[PDB]
Each structure stands twice: as C-alpha cells, then as structure tokens.
DNA sequence: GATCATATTGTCCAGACAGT
DNA sequence: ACTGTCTGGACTGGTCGGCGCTATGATC
C-alpha cells in the first residue's frame, strides 16, 4: 500500500553514518575534463548521480531527470569545528570537566534537575530556561565535584576559536589555543547520562559529532551543472566551495605525510576550517565571505534555506504551479457575480481532466473528435494504463473510436466550469474566490463590478490570476466553500463586501428619487435588460398627456421579496423633522396605511413595507459596501442565492437607468456665483488678518502659552486652527450654493464616488498644505521659498493655498501642493511594507489556531487557547453588527410577519 | 488598602477545589499541562493566596457573551 | 443534525472521486454532466451514502 | 495613516502586537475620587502632585560661575 | 605556436553582557 | 540590582520585460 510521514526526528549525522550513506569518496577537485566527460573521483562523478541526458548513473542505473542523486563523503585530514554548533561546543566545554569528563554538578543537583526535566517537557521555553540555568550553575564551578580536578575559564572567539586561560608555573595567565582535535577529544569523554543535562541526546546528537571529521558532499542533483550558449560550463557556488575544500584538504594531507613543521600544519588547518565555515554559512560574522573570481560573494547551504528566495519561503511555503493563467481584467456587468470571463485562447490551452463515465461518454468522445484546434475539444487523452497521449489531426479519430470507460480526457474549458480567481496581494481570504467559466472571444479576463471591492481591483491595467483545479476533491471544495455568493458578508466586520458601487448607487438614486417617472417602453426595456421575471406591468401610478407613467419606486419594489419590511435613515437625510413624522407614524400603528405613508414620504427616510418602497431613495446605505442595510438583511433573511439574484438584477436595472437617462459632469458643476466668490475671498482675508494679528501678538509677547507647549508651538497650533476653521467656512459657503441637481453633488452625497470636500477644493479653495502634521518649513533660512521674506510666519508663506483648482494655483501654491502630494505618496509607499510585514508576522503567529468540534480553540500541542471561540461561539461573519443575536430586528420582523 | 480586584480591568479570580478541578479536566478531556498558565508572582495569585498546581477560575466580563469563564493553572516563576 | 460546509465539501469530493473511477450513480442524471455535477445532484436528492464520523 | 503626542495608527498597533517593553510616548489616564473630580482646583493640585518637576525646567538659564567655584 | 594546475581568505528592536 | 554597550536580524506579495556576467599566466 502507501504510507505517510508521521513524525520527523532531527539530530547530528555521525561520521560512521556519513561514511555508510556515502556512495563514493571524492578526492579530485576537478569536475570536467577537456572533452566534457565527468572525471572519476571528482565532484561530478557519476556515482553521485547524473545531470547530462546521455549520462548513466553508476549507483542507480537510471538516466537524467529521474536519478535522485547520491551523497558522497570527504575524509578530512584534520577535524574542523562546525560553525553552526560553535556556541553549543563552547557551552558544553564550559559546563564539563576538562579531564574527568563529567558535568560540573553534584549528584543531588543532577537528580533534582532530572526530576525537574520530566515536569516541564511540553513547553520548549521551560526546557531552554532550565538548560541556561544548568549551564550558568556549572560555568562558575572551578573544581569538579566528581574528581577534584582544577578547571580554567574558556574564552570563545568568533567564529570557531576557543581559548583556555591556563596558569603558568609563576602564576602568570596565558591564553592557550584549543585545537579542534583537542576539543573533540574533550567532548568524547562526556558520558551519555550527562547529555540530557546539557541538552543533547545520547543516541541522536553526541557532543563529539559537532566537530566534523567527515564532510558529506551533496549529490549532483542538489548542485546541478549547466552549459552556456558558448559551451562553457557554469558550475554552482557549492561546487566551487567544495573544489576549494578538496584542494585545501589534499594539500594538508600531503604536508602531513611529508612531515611538515607544525607552523605549516596550523596554517593549513586554519585555511581548511575557514573553507568549511564558509561552506556551511558564507554570511558568518567576523569571517570574510567567500568570493568568486569575478568578485561575487557565493551563497551556500545556509543561504539556500533562509531568506525570501530560500528553500522554505521560495519553494516550500510558496511555489509556481501548473494550469494557471494571467491577463488584464476588463469590466463585464452582463455576467453574474458568480461568473468570470475566460478568453477562448486561454480556455483552449487550460484543460480539465474528466474521466469517461456512462453519463458523459458521448460528450467526451465529441471532445476527442474535435481535437485541440476545434472548440470545444481536447488536447490530451490518458488511457487506464496511465500513459498520456497527445491529440493531433492524425490520431484524433483512432483515439475517439478507442475511448472507453476509465479513460481520462483533458478537454478544453467549458461554460459552468469552476476556476479560482485571484488578485495580488492577497490581504484577506476574499482575495481568492471560485467563479464559473464564461468563454469570450477577446484576450481579457472579465469580472463583475460588485466583485471588485473584495479584490480591491480597478480597471486601470490590473492583471489577475486564474487557477483551474484538476482533481474532483479540489473542484468540489472550490464549488462548495469558495464560491463568490458564499462570501458576500465580510467576516472582518460582519457587513456586506460584495455590494454595489458608484454607477449602481447613482442609478438607484436616479430611479428611486422623488418625481422620477418612466414610460411603458422604458419600464419594459429595463425589465428585459435586468432579467426580471415580469410578464405583465403593474397599474400605472399616474397619467400625463394621456400616456401612462410608472414611478421608479414601483419598479424598484419588484426586486424585493414580498414579505420584507425595513425602515431606516439614509445619507440623504438633511431634515430630521420630516423623518420624525414617518417614525412616529410607523411606531404608533406598526402597520401604517400605504396611502398615509406616501402623503408624508421623504427621500431621506427609506421605508419598505411588504416589499414595496413606500418612501426614501437609494444610496450607499441601501446596498453599498459596509453600509447597505437592505442587502445585509436580504443575505441574512433570504440566503445567499436570493441575494445573488437580487444583486445581479439590481445592478443591471440601475445601469440601464443611468445609461439611458444621461449622467454627466462638466466644467459648470464647480461654477459659483460672484457673491459666493466674494464671501470666500472675505473669509480668506479675515483668516489672513487673524493670522497676522496672532503673529503680531506673539512678537509683542502678549501671546499666552498653552499648557505643555512653548510660544512657537502655541502660535503654530492657533494658526493651524484658524486656517482649518477658514477652510470649513469656505466649504460650507460652497456647499450652500451647490444643490441636489448637480451630478457631482449627487455622486458625493449618495456615497457613489468622491466626497463633499473633493468638490470644495475645486470650487472654493484648497486650504493649508502640511507635512507630518506641521506647516511647511523645509527650505531656506527662515523661509520655505526665496520669494517670501525671511522670518515670515504668515499663512501664505507657510503653505496656505487661497486659490482653488478652478481658479488656478500660483507657482508657490503649486510647489506647496506638490510637497503635500509627495508626502502622501511617500507615506503610502512606506506604510505598505510595514503593514505587509505585520500581516506576515500575525499569520505565522496564528496559523495553527482552529475551532474544534466542542467549540474550543487549541494549539497543535493540545493547550486550550479559548474554551469557546469569541467567548460565545459565534462566527464574526454571521454576527449582527458585532453582537450575538439582533433581538430587536428578530422581534420586529416576527411581529410584522404575524400581524401582516 | 486598595484591593486588586476593585479595578475595572481585573476580573474576578477564584481558586477551584480539587473536585472542581478534576471535573474541569474531565469535561475538556485535557491534562493539567494543557491549561493556560498563570505565574505564581501574579498580583491576583498573591491576593488569593494560591500556590503552584492550583487552577484559577476567572469570570471575565465578555463584550459578546456578558460573562465568560476562563481557567488558568498556577505555575512557578 | 446538520452538515457543516467543510463536511459537505468533503462528502461531495469523495462522491465525485468515487464516480470518476466507477461507483455508478444511484439516481437518474442528465447526459453530458461532470461527476461533480452528479455528486451535487445526489446530495440535492438526499441519496448520499457517505456519513461523517464525529468525536465523542 | 502614519504619524497630546499620542502617535496612534500603524506604529501603535505594531508596538502593541510586538509587546514593546517601553511604548513610544507613554500616556497615563488618571481618575479622581469624589473629593477631587468636581472642582478644577483639586484636580490641579492632584496633577501637580503627580507631575514630576526637577530643577532644570524651573531654571531660566544656565551659567557656570568660577569666582565662587 | 598548444596545454596545465591554480586560482586569497543601514535605522531600529531585542537579547546577552561588563561596569558601578 | 540598574545602565549603557555589543551583537544579531529583518527589512509587503505578485507580475511585466531588459541587460550583462560567470579564466589566466607559464612552459613544452
Ligand atoms: Mg489599479
Ligand atoms: Zn543515481
Ligand atoms: Zn571531573
């Protein structure tokens, strides 16, 4: 059968294990000869694997691409210290007797630590603290309790140098260098019983194994060799490092065999130690990194695992995948929110493997007969034996007549297929959702507009990735869990995320506003466009010139369910006295007459009774993101499919309404009368006079300092407050003369796009430009620009733009606005990286937490983090405004349903 | 003197009995080492006079559930 | 007793995998559909034979 | 958004989740009992009792004198 | 004129550590 | 027991494409 990995046990490889697992001994530094054949005994020996296609492995007998590679070994002439175990070696040497070999602890202390180790074993932090305490206790001891032999302090010098402070005959203290052979001999005397006290395992990690005597050379598959376009081989950095190691080891062995003096032996030993240390880690502190001939700092085994481009993050936690596509996205309101537009070229390339069954034999046979060049067709066919056959014109008929039950047909992407649609960066779980394939002739992806806010995607050149699941389990998981309609409500705040946007909101406002009426032709056309299942028109609301007319509220009410009742205040409510009468009428009777409601109907108060929009207008509070009460109620009380249908119908209806009525903005939308401009100029002049008076008072010393601040900050705060008040007054003056008939004002007030402040800047004035919360000061001595006098603290000299976008900015005001915009762009480009790093840290901290079947949240070890998730066991996605149950809404809905 | 439990941020702390601790362990099917830990030098522990090895029942003021029960095991510093 | 989304997805995936390599459909299905569609139809008809083991 | 003197935002949440031993610009919220929370004079004297005042802030200027050493 | 060995050894935050 | 100092580390994801660079000195 098949087996899976249950657990992984780590340790230090013994020299005997390295020798036994080795397939060959490497002694020749050279890799390839002049003819290009591998050299026997070299680093590219065929016993370690094969890279070239024509080569055959002497250990496996297989060809390139399927030989896994085999490890070698190098017999070092002298032992060397592993740089990754240097601190542990120093700690163990400090914590152990030099000649006796036992740990410098009493028997009672050893027993006490042995019993304490069993109690604290689950938490690795407790074990680390116990190890540190044992090391600290054993370090201060200068006499071994087991034998009474005197001890000397051991000094550790980076990277792998150990100094022993021995005492001379006259009492002088001199440093004695401990060679790796002496260190290994000292480590060999430690018994197995003291190893748990030192944090080592008797059978897995012996202390003497931390001093390397046999170096395992990696297989050639781990360090592949390529050839360039000019025929010159490009060896890996590990290959060059191993070449240097082999050369130095051979030179050291030859010098040892030649009886060289000890001075040469120490130099060669140090060179070999440096080479081994750089091979293990080329970024070790205090070590000059190994450099290539061209000057390139080589990357080694340590660099291949850590970092963004390491083995873990770059190849294990994340990697490139097959059956994926990426292209520019384009809007498509005609498709549903559950659908994605797939190009025909993309569909004809990406394939889904479908097994031949009894109920789909004819379809797959037709797909095979069509071939790869005829849509809908197939590209590959897999027999039950498991081999893959490519489909072409010559053999498409032979395969088609040979098709049977159990075959696999890699047909092209068809309508209704489930694929993954993703936009980067993936900040939340809504960044990847499963859509339905819709095949289109052009070369762009198509995404429905309400699905843009979950992706945070616009259409100014955005590109998105498409993934096609290949297994039945993955397809089922995508279809059940990751469908678009299943994630309308955002789990972050428990509100709508897949909601209407600017044009939908504007069209809804245009349709549902007071005085909006449509002819029979317009109503029928918008009903056909929206796909609503309406066969007969309702009774006309009024007649004009002998022609029937339908109110927009009547057309909008066809979308709502017949048993839906809700009332609230939208963003268009500017006269609360009109909403108060409606609220009192609703409260008094709880079933108000529809004629009575329409008599005192107000656009700012939306009231839906039994699915009929009796009052109010559609805005961002209707079905907008994070504010749509109607959409949120529809999701919670009618399911996700009904909500998806409602969204698909209402988006098309509002799009038709806004398209044929005519929505536009012009240069006269920001126009203001002369009296408004005069008032704005008067406000600006008054603010400038106030700033000048404050400056004069500060110069005369009459300014009262604020608590906790000196005169300069007090004056700056007063000036900024005055300028902000002036900007607010100018904005109010501009808002006074901009009525509801303005399309830009409609867009700002309905929440479709933009703000009132955006219209204020173009109409009245820009205001004060500031960076880092302070007025502009960077420039010359005492002045931002030379055009102003030195020492001028006035508003105009510090970044107060009196002009507006329509009036035209002065060059100084242009420079100030450029400073502000640069500050904003820099702030965004700096904040993004910190936010991403914090998100990665949080993800890695809370990756393993999940809710068990009993409602508890536990770590993989088993420690209970929460006895109930959220202390109430309620999903934030299904929570009503952060609460457990919306009691008032339930009571009101039940009472209305039973009394209606 | 100012009691440590009069603060709004400090929830009620109560030392569980032996039978109560055994019932709590049996209910969640966990060992004594799978519970959250509280240091013996904690002000609540020294106010209650508890010793390492006991389980403290904490009556949290839940913003969502009103009142929530949390359990912590006293451990040495 | 109600199925969770994860349990339903796992059941549908297992049934689709079974249908792909044998396991004839227990209900009538339209021709030309995928095994995933057949598993979804079986779940809609309430005819699935796969149960869920829960801790106790 | 990046950047009295409370410095909230992304740096604040970063400091919170990183369990910083000393947060940047610490702020202490101090409440008063029934004898001091009603009138401004009692609050002012409580604040001046809490606030730490040293000699360098009280001094107007610093001048080293050599005649008296 | 062809080949062959050899080719060198950037601020900030947090934990550990001499100094008083 | 505090306090300033030395050392280690990580520096948001994806995508697009381009542009170089991967021997040399001394015999026989
Ligand atoms: Mg964009
Ligand atoms: Zn092999
Ligand atoms: Zn000894």
The domain boundary residue, chosen from A463, A487, A511: A487
Between the two ends of chain D, the Cα-to-Cα distance in Å is 54
Sign of the four-CA dihedral A755, A760, A766, A771? negative
- Name the residue range of residue A528's domain: 488-662+875-893
- Strands in A857-858's sheet, in edge-to-edge order, are A850-851, A857-858, A864-866
B30 with A862: Cβ contact below 8 A: yes
Whole-number Å distance, alpha carbon B20 to ligand 2 midpoint, is 63
> In angstroms, what is the C-alpha Rg of chain B?
13
Whether A819 is in a domain gets the answer: no
- Answer yes or no: are the C-beta atoms of C20 and A473 closer than 8 Å: no
Between the two ends of chain C, the Cα-to-Cα distance in Å is 14
Contacts for A403 with CB less than 8 Å, ≥ 6 apart? A356, A361, A364, A365, A368, A381, A409
A802 and A769 together in one domain: yes
A476 and A582 together in one domain: no
Taking Cα atoms as reference points, which of A602, A537, A600, A595 lies closest to residue A570? A602
H, E, C per residue of A386-421: CCEEECCCCCHHHHHHCCCCCCEEEEECCCCCEEEE
A476 with C12: Cβ contact below 8 A: yes
Cβ–Cβ contacts within 10 Å for residue A416, how many? 12
Instruction: For A235, list phi and psi in degrees, rounded to 5.
Output: -75, 155
Cβ–Cβ contacts within 10 Å for residue A332, how many? 18
For residue A465, give both structure tokens: 């990735």
Is the link from the previous residue into A589 a cis peptide, with omega within 30 of 0? Answer: no
Cβ–Cβ contacts within 10 Å for residue A854, how many? 13
- Answer yes or no: are the C-beta atoms of A524 and A653 closer than 8 Å: no
Q: How far apart are CA A622 and CA A508, in angstroms?
A: 9
Q: How far apart are CA A516 and CA A552, in angstroms?
A: 6
Whether A870 is in a domain gets the answer: no
Which D residues 10-39 have CB within 7 Å of strand E?
A: 18-21, 24
For residue A780, give both structure tokens: 């010359």
For residue A65, give both structure tokens: 């691409």
Contacts for A307 with CB less than 8 Å, ≥ 6 apart? A313, A314
- Answer yes or no: are the C-beta atoms of A458 and A329 closer than 8 Å: no
Contacts for D61 with CB less than 8 Å, ≥ 6 apart? none
Residue with tokens 């800047």: A761
Nucleotide closest in space to A30 (CA vs C1'): E5
A232 and A335 together in one domain: no
A95 and A241 together in one domain: yes
Between the two ends of chain B, the Cα-to-Cα distance in Å is 26
For residue A612, give both structure tokens: 């009929």
Taking Cα atoms as reference points, which of A597, A598, A607 lies closest to residue A570? A607
For residue A155, give both structure tokens: 């000094």
Give the domain CATH number at A779: 1.10.132.30
DSSP state of A385: T
Q: How far apart are CA A552 and CA A653, in angstroms?
A: 11
Identify the experimental approach.
cryo-EM
Instruction: For A183, list phi and psi in degrees, rounded to 5.
Output: -65, -45
H, E, C per residue of A140-197: CCCECCCCCCECCCEEEECCCEEEEEEECCCCCEEEEEECHHHHHHHHHCCCCCCCHH
- Answer yes or no: are the C-beta atoms of A278 and A241 closer than 8 Å: yes
Whether A821 is in a domain gets the answer: no
Task: Give me the helices (H) in A804-884, please.
Answer: 811-845
* A838 → closest Cβ in D1, D3, D14: D14
Whole-number Å distance, alpha carbon A190 to ligand 3 midpoint, is 10
A657 and A575 together in one domain: yes
Instruction: Report the distance from CA of residue A257 to the C1' of nucleotide F4 in Å, as an integer.
Output: 53
Cross-strand partners of A73: A25
Whether A291 CB is under 7 Å from strand E: yes
Instruction: For A577, list phi and psi in degrees, rounded to 5.
Output: -65, -30
Give the domain CATH number at A377: 3.30.1490.180
Q: Strand, coil or helix: what is A445?
A: strand
A329 and A185 together in one domain: no
A105-140 burial: b if 16+ Cβ within 10 Å, else e = beeebbeebeeebeebeeeeebeeebbeebbebbee
Taking Cα atoms as reference points, which of A257, A87, A93 lies closest to residue A184? A93
A888 and A780 together in one domain: no
- Answer yes or no: are the C-beta atoms of A537 and A520 closer than 8 Å: yes
Instruction: For B43, list phi and psi in degrees, rounded to 5.
Output: -60, -35
Chain A hits for B36, CB-CB cut-off 8 Å, are 863-865
Q: How far apart are CA A722 and CA A218, in angstroms?
A: 72
Q: How far apart are CA A436 and CA A423, in angstroms?
A: 16
Q: What is the CATH number of domain B1-76?
A: 3.90.940.20
Q: Strand, coil or helix: what is A128?
A: helix
Whether A100 has a binding-site annotation, put simply, is yes
DSSP output for B21-49: HHHHHHHHT--GGGS-EEETT-HHHHHHT
For residue A332, give both structure tokens: 């498509």
Whether A604 is in a domain gets the answer: yes
A667 and A608 together in one domain: no
> In angstroms, what is the C-alpha Rg of chain D?
19
Q: How far apart are CA C54 and CA A633, in angstroms?
A: 33
The domain boundary residue, chosen from A810, A831, A862: A810
For residue A195, give both structure tokens: 């190893």
Whether A673 is in a domain gets the answer: yes
A309 and A400 together in one domain: no
For residue B50, give both structure tokens: 């508890």
Per 3-state DSSP, chain C is made up of helix, strand and coil in percentages (nearest 5) of: 50, 0, 50
DSSP state of A703: P
Chain A hits for C36, CB-CB cut-off 8 Å, are 418, 472, 475-476, 479
Cβ–Cβ contacts within 10 Å for residue A412, how many? 23
Instruction: For B55, list phi and psi in degrees, rounded to 5.
Output: -115, 125
Contacts for A354 with CB less than 8 Å, ≥ 6 apart? A360, A364, A408, A409, A410, A411, C34, C35
Cβ–Cβ contacts within 10 Å for residue A69, how many? 19
Alpha carbons within 13 angstroms on the beta-carbon side of residue A162 total: 27
Q: How far apart are CA A828 and CA A836, in angstroms?
A: 12
Cα A135–Cα A136–Cα A142 angle in degrees, nearest 5: 95
Cβ–Cβ contacts within 10 Å for residue A324, how many? 14
Q: Strand, coil or helix: what is A665?
A: coil
- What residues of B are in the A interface, CB distance below 8 Å? 28, 30-31, 33-36, 60, 62, 64-65, 68-71
Whether A403 is in a domain gets the answer: yes
CA dihedral A477, A478, A482, A483 (to 10 degrees): -120
Taking Cα atoms as reference points, which of A699, A704, A702 lies closest to residue A717? A704
Whether A433 is in a domain gets the answer: yes
- Segments making up each domain of chain B, as ranges: 1-76
A427 and A493 together in one domain: no
- Answer yes or no: are the C-beta atoms of A371 and A393 closer than 8 Å: yes
Chain C touching partners, 3 or more CB pairs below 8 A: A
Q: Which residues surround ligand 2, an ion (CB under 5 A)?
A: A 49, 57, 59-60, 67
DSSP run (H or E) holding A647: helix A629-661
Cα A822–Cα A828–Cα A831 angle in degrees, nearest 5: 135
Contacts for A452 with CB less than 8 Å, ≥ 6 apart? A458, A501
Q: How far apart are CA A423 and CA A432, in angstroms?
A: 7
Alpha carbons within 13 angstroms on the beta-carbon side of residue A277 total: 22
**Pairing mode, strands B55-62 and B66-75:** antiparallel
- Number of domains present in the structure of chain A: 5
Contact status of D4 with chain A (Cβ, < 8 Å): yes
- Answer yes or no: are the C-beta atoms of A619 and A571 closer than 8 Å: yes
- Answer yes or no: are the C-beta atoms of A618 and A509 closer than 8 Å: yes
Query: In terms of C-beta density within 10 A (0-12 exposed, 13-18 middle, 19 or more buried), how is residue A798 classed?
Result: buried
A118 and A25 together in one domain: yes
Distances in Å between the alpha carbon of A768 and those of A413, A418, A759? Answer: 56, 53, 16
Whether A867 is in a domain gets the answer: no
A689 and A750 together in one domain: yes
DSSP output for A491-518: TTTTEE-S-B-HHHHHHHHHHHSTT-EE
Taking Cα atoms as reference points, which of A397, A394, A400, A414 lies closest to residue A364? A400
Q: Strand, coil or helix: what is A328?
A: strand
Instruction: For A749, list phi and psi in degrees, rounded to 5.
Output: -75, -40
């Amino acid at each position: 059968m098949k087996k899976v990995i249950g657990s992984i046990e780590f340790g230090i490889l013994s020299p005997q294990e390295i020798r036994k697992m080795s397939a060959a001994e490497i002694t020749v530094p050279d890799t390839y000869d002049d003819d290009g054949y591998p050299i026997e005994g070299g680093l590219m020996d065929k016993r370690l694997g094969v890279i070239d296609p024509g080569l055959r492995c002497e250990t496996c007998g297989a060809r390139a691409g399927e030989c896994p590679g085999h490890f070698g070994h190098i017999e070092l002439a002298r032992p060397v210290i592993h740089v990754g175990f240097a601190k542990t070696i120093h700690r163990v040497l400090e914590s152990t007797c030099r000649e006796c070999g036992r740990i410098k602890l009493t028997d009672e202390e050893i027993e006490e630590y042995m019993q304490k180790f069993e109690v604290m074993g689950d938490r690795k932090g407790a074990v680390d603290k116990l190890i540190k305490e044992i090391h600290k206790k054993a370090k201060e001891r200068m006499v071994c309790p087991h034998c009474g032999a005197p001890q000397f302090p051991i000094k550790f010098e980076r990277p792998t140098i150990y100094w022993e402070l021995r005492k001379d005959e006259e009492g002088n203290e001199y440093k004695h260098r401990m060679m790796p052979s002496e260190v290994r001999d000292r480590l060999e005397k430690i018994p197995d019983k003291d190893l748990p006290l030192l944090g080592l395992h008797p059978e897995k990690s012996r202390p003497e194994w931390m001093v390397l005597t046999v170096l395992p050379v990696p297989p050639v598959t781990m360090r592949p060799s390529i050839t360039l376009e000019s025929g010159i081989r490009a060896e890996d950095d590990l290959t060059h490092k191993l070449v240097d190691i082999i050369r130095i080891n051979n030179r050291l062995k030859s010098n040892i065999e030649a009886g060289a003096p000890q001075l040469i032996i120490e130099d060669l030993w140090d060179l070999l130690q440096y080479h081994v240390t750089t091979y293990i880690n080329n970024e070790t502190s205090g070590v000059p990194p190994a450099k290539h001939k061209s000057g390139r700092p080589l990357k080694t085994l340590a660099q291949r695992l850590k970092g963004k481009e390491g083995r873990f993050r770059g190849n294990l936690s994340g990697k490139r995948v097959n059956f994926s596509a990426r292209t520019v996205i384009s809007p498509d309101p005609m498709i549903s929110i559950n659908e994605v537009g797939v190009p025909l070229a993309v569909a004809m390339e990406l394939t889904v493997p479908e097994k031949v069954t009894e109920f789909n034999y004819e379809k797959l046979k037709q797909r095979v007969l069509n071939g790869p060049e005829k849509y809908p067709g197939a590209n590959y066919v897999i027999d039950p034996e498991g081999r893959r056959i490519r489909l072409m014109e010559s053999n498409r008929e032979l395969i088609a007549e040979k098709l049977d039950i159990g075959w696999t047909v890699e047909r092209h992407l068809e309508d209704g297929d489930v694929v993954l649609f993703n936009r980067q960066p993936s900040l939340h779980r809504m960044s990847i959702m499963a859509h339905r394939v819709r095949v289109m002739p052009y070369r762009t992806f198509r995404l429905n507009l309400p699905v843009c806010p979950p992706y945070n995607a616009d259409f100014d050149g955005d590109e998105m990735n498409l993934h096609v699941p290949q297994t039945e389990e993955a397809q089922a998981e995508a279809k059940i869990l990751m469908e678009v309609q299943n994630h309308i409500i955002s789990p972050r705040y428990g509100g709508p995320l897949i909601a209407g946007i600017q044009d939908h909101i504007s069209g809804g406002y245009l349709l549902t506003r007071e005085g909006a009426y449509f002819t029979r032709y317009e109503v029928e056309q918008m009903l056909m466009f929206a796909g609503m299942d309406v066969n007969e028109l309702p009774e006309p609301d009024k007649y004009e010139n002998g022609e029937p007319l339908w109110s927009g509220k009547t057309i909008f009410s066809l979308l709502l369910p017949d048993d839906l009742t809700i009332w609230y205040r939208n963003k268009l409510c500017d006269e609360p006295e009109r909403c108060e009468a409606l609220e009192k009428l609703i409260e008094e009777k709880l079933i108000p007459d529809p004629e009575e409601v329409r008599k005192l109907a107000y656009d700012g108060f939306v009231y839906i009774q039994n699915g009929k929009l009796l009052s109010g207008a559609v805005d961002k509070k209707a079905y907008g993101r994070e504010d749509g009460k109607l959409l949120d109620i529809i999701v919670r009380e009618y399911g996700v499919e009904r909500a998806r249908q409602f969204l698909d119908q209402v988006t098309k209806l509002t799009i038709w309404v806004i398209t044929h009525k005519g929505f536009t903005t012009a240069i006269d939308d920001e126009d203001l009368p002369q009296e408004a401009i005069d008032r704005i100029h008067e406000i600006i002049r008054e603010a400038e006079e106030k700033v000048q008076r404050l400056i004069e008072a500060y110069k005369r010393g009459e300014l009262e300092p604020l608590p906790g601040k000196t005169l300069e900050e007090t004056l700056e705060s007063k000036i900024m407050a005055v300028l902000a008040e002036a900007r607010d007054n100018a904005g109010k003056v501009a808002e006074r003369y901009l009525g509801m008939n303005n399309h830009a004002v409609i867009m700002a007030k309905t929440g479709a796009r933009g703000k009132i402040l955006n219209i204020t800047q173009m109409a009245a004035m820009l205001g004060q430009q500031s960076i880092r919360g302070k007025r502009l000061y960077r420039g010359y001595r005492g002045r931002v620009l030379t055009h102003f006098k030195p020492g001028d603290l006035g508003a105009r000299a510090r970044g107060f733009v009196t002009n507006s976008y329509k009036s035209g900015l002065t060059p100084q005001e242009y420079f100030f606005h450029a400073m502000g915009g640069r500050e904003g762009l820099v702030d965004t480009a700096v904040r993004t990286a910190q936010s991403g790093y914090m998100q990665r840290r949080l993800i890695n901290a809370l990756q393993d937490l999940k809710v068990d079947y009993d409602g508890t949240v536990r770590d993989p070890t088993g420690i209970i983090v929460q006895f109930k998730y959220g202390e109430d066991g309620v999903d934030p996605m299904k929570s009503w405004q952060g609460k457990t149950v919306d009691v008032d809404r339930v009571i009101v809905r039940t009472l209305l349903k039973m009394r209606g | 003197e100012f009691n440590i439990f009069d603060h709004v941020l400090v929830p009620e702390h109560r030392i569980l009995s032996e039978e109560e601790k055994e019932e709590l362990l049996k209910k969640y099917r966990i060992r004594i080492s799978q519970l959250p830990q509280i240091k013996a030098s904690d002000p609540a522990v020294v106010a209650l006079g508890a010793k390492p090895g006991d389980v403290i029942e904490i009556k949290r003021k839940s913003p969502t559930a009103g009142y929530y029960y949390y359990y912590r095991l006293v451990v040495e510093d | 007793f109600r199925y969770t989304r994860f349990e339903k997805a796992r059941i549908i995936g297992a049934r689709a995998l079974q249908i792909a390599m044998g396991a004839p459909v227990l209900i009538d299905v339209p021709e030309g559909i995928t095994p995933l569609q057949a598993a979804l139809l079986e779940f809609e008809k309430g005819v699935i034979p796969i149960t869920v083991i829960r801790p106790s | 958004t990046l950047n009295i003197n409370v410095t909230l935002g992304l740096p604040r949440i970063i400091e919170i989740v990183d369990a910083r031993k000393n947060p940047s610009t610490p702020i202490m919220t101090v409440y008063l009992d029934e004898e001091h929370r009603y009138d401004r004079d009692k609050a002012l004297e409580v604040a001046r009792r809490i606030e730490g005042t040293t000699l360098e802030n009280l001094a107007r200027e610093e001048t080293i004198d050599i005649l008296n050493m």
